[PDB]
Nucleic acid binder design. Structure first.
Ligand SMILES: [Mg+2]
Ligand SMILES: [Mg+2]
Ligand SMILES: [Mg+2]
Ligand SMILES: [Mg+2]
Lengths: 236, 241
DNA sequence: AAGATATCTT
DNA sequence: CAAGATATCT
């Protein structure tokens, strides 16, 4: 399927290549830093070609945001089927071990159908995440003839594709920027989809009603159990 | 000066090289993106080798942060002058059309500026200078960009024309916040020449620091204290009340 | 759990 | 402009 083919192309591209630097039109190469801000950008760009390839093999157009305050990285849909859009978002985190990802905000497009999203939320039937996990490890320039001398910015990189709701946790991934937090698990759990939410419906209701701070949460719910109890009390 | 040498090299390299892609160890090339998240990453990496070259030429060591929530991008210092550290930070923004007004977010006003060792590589008072290497690029619509290339000139560049300046943070500082929830100092909102020339709003670097160290976090609160330079000077005139 | 890391948008 | 968004980190 589109999914199987994409996850397949993603494992392959990852196993075959290693980004090691930025190159100029004149052949001079600058080394990559070993931090998420750099790697996230690089992992996304490394994914682009592969996502566009498979999307076309399946007849899906690929649209990236035109504006910078918008989720998702890539919007795939068939022209004949505009309300069957697929959201594919790239996320990165590192290990020195269990990982965690910040999964987007909980007060934007999930609480407002047209907020910070390329197309209205209700037009997407799936929300996938391509998660890159890298083990964290030059101030000079190099040329084409020196590609193997350039230090790589990672000890190894793994990638997985998984549905957002499936890997979502019940604890916020960030405070002031109110992001849904993923599960805090070993990469295995992400590939396998060993989440805590019973369904995508449950995941959504939870994050749509999660209070921004502990003050408010301490009288509603702070975790999955309290939420399920909150539901039993009649959503109050 | 290190400063004159630095700006000349940044300026020269800017006018003679154009980054166009990420290359792999195998030689595969992935085209770049056109948004700021990508470009600020590119611009910083492009800057690094120059900053390091010029620094060494003046006997300065260059240190980059160790943890990810630390300012600045590059801390320069001579062993002989440990309390004379120079903070060199790289900022980037874009413009939809060449020669438009621009603005930068100049770091938070509630971390190191209010607390000597909070979110900074070295204690705030060990730096005598805080420079901003500012990059401005004209956005270009993203297509050849979607495929890989073999070994350059054929690859579409995600920008029309990069501009670079070097200037003291206090000099280009404005009086309005650069961000809300992340409490950043905002720069002046003006043309590029204005940043190069230092046409800012504060009189001294101490006025810069006092203003931002006492700027309240919301319009609500600011309304009773001060929301712009004018208001702050009146507030200063009355005895800080 | 809350607020830092840089910058953009309405 | 205010404020809250865009991604992660500590
Ligand atoms: Mg993107
Ligand atoms: Mg992403
Ligand atoms: Mg840096
Ligand atoms: Mg920077």
């Amino acid at each position: 399927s589109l999914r199987s083919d994409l996850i397949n192309a993603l494992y392959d591209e990852n196993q075959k290549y290693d980004v090691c630097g930025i190159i100029s039109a004149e052949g001079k190469i600058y080394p990559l830093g070993s931090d998420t801000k750099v790697l996230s950008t690089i992992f996304e760009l490394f994914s682009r070609p592969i996502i566009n390839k498979i999307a076309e093999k399946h007849g899906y157009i690929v649209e990236e945001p035109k504006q910078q305050n918008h989720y998702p990285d890539f919007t795939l849909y068939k022209p004949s089927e505009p309300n069957k859009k697929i959201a594919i978002d790239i996320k990165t985190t590192y290990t020195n071990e269990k990982i965690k990802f910040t999964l987007g905000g909980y007060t934007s497009f999930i609480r407002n159908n047209t907020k910070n999203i390329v197309y209205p939320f209700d037009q997407y039937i799936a929300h996938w995440i391509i998660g890159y996990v890298y083990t964290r490890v030059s101030l000079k320039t190099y040329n084409i003839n020196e590609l193997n001398e350039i230090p790589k910015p990672y000890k190894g990189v793994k990638v997985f594709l998984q549905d957002k709701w499936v890997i979502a946790g019940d604890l916020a991934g960030s405070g002031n920027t109110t992001n849904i937090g993923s599960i805090h698990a070993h990469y295995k759990d992400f590939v396998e989809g060993k989440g805590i939410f019973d369904s995508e419906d449950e995941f959504l209701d939870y994050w749509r009603n999660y209070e921004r701070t502990s003050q408010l949460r301490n009288d509603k719910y702070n975790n999955i159990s309290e939420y399920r109890n909150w539901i039993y009390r009649g959503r109050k």
